[PDB]
Amino acid sequence: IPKPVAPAPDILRCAYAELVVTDLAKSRNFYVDVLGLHVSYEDENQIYLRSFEEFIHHNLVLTKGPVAALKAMAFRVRTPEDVDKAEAYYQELGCRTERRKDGFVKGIGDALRVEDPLGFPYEFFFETTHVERLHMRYDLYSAGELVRLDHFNQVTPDVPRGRKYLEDLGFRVTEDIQDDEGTTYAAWMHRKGTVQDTALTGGNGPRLHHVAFSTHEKHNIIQICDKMGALRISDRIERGPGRHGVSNAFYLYILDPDNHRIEIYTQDYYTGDPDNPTITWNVHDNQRRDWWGNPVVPSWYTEASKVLDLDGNVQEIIERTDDSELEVTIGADGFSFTRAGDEDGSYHGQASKGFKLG
Template sequence: MDFNIIRCARAVLHVTDLDKSREFYVKALGFIETEADDQHIYLRGLEECGHHSLLLKKSDEAHVEAISYKVSSEEDLDRLEQFFTLKGMKTIWMEKGTQKGVGRALRVQDISGLPIEYFASMDQVSRMLQRYDLYTGSRVQRIDHFNCMVKDVEKAHDFYIKELGFACSEYTEDEHKKIWAAWLHRKHTVHDQAFMNGEGPRIHHIGFWLPDPLALIHACDVLAASGFGKSIERGPGRHGLSNAFFLYLRDPDGHRIELYNGDYLTSDPDFNPVCWDLDDPQRQTFWGHEAPDSWFNEASSVLDIETRKPLKTGEPTLKKRKPTFVI
């Protein structure tokens, strides 16, 4: 590859009420608020020294504007722009100074229609890792992954591996050996990017890493005591896929957040992807209650990178079966 994608790095969500969002993300979940104005809230985890990993933008409707990856250099951005242009994909530049905290960025509507952003530089702020006096709520540490519903998982899987240099850690296939869901990574954990079979393109959830399982349990207590008990959609529990200890939440606008801990290292060059059969019940819930229908059917809409209007979605290429999941 002529470019180096490092890791998932931030998400830009449109929300309808910044005050309600602050109550949820800062007071209940314990995100660090880097700064804010009457149109934006910039949030980060305790171990993050980048300006933010989650940007909440005030809007009349709730959508996902972009999910972002950090790359190694400014030259990587230029090479990515050339690459996507040659592939016939739509790109736009977000010049330095147009987004607070972030340098020049490239946005592309990817192979599945997802609005993906790449950037090389972000303003640095104080890392709060050892500010234990600030550990509240879920004690969220950092952004970990994106999970996206797409019409053709195998197409997305092949493009991200063969063209963008991602590696696969785990995947689910059906009886015809077609890929139903896939977990792909650039950093040396289970995933930066997951794809699940469904109506798309949509964003299913954004995952954030917690320091330990107890932090996840404590988050449930804080959410309930703060009046956000109904925001808990699924869990806590453990996935077979990735071995993750998980909790799924819906924010005040319905965006899904996963609190996540317990996956494993994938850095060895001879690591072989784990294949799960679609009919294996342990792949989705190693233990814990089954997911509700909303978990399989609902997701956040995404925006066109140029018009900023919601993209139309389409039915998946693989026929629907009994509910399945990715993490």
């Protein structure tokens, strides 16, 4: 993917995702009643939701449709003129673009959507309707309150190809996972001064791995799990809670009614200095994904959401040919270590903590 002559748009941060869902009422139950997100607008076709500290119109749009999928992952840009820059940048890349002066969803103004070089539906916008910032509305605060939108994670077959593209677009790599023979399994990259605004996971794609929201404290994440147990929907807790190695964040992954994966995340570190030290982890290091060594559940490696093109049809999936992280770590010929070079605390042909793949 060549670097355009045209300047990249100045991207501020991840801003919202539009997810297609099959049953809007069941989705509302999950995101509003279980998770406590705040309704900015709703009707029979869509629900627009925001986090506790947000002032732009929404962080999540649920749109009723026939096939559950990512419709758009939206980044806010610094100025109105940056939408023009986005259009010219992606035009030069040869990508299909669509510009709407009055936006694609309610509460957004002039917006550009693109089918990007990795097959993902990106939106770029500046203009958005401001709403009441709920950051001191402690009369509304949930024991599991979701306070910010933090990041997206994308599944794509060739991580270096996507990384180079995102670097040209101005994202900076913070962390990655590699092996000794030069394969890259995952990379994390940011615009705002946190570990990530989007991230790439090696795998068959394009698929959307997850959308991540932040909490203030670790106990808020614990409460989400506790509430899911009380609602007898613990089967929708996919992975965690844990401490990540990469990012150092406390985390949880859960599954919405259409199997879209949502991460809850807190307490990663500042990355805003331009010489921020990068960190590379070895793929066999059993503390890289869960710092406590807990096993990564196989569905985390295999399952992700479909994404749509700009006509609303599902994007064709291209298979990864580089090595599989699942296979090399927890498969029958996989291994992981606790201490590099130590047989004690290593796992061969199975996961940590006494489990193999089901």
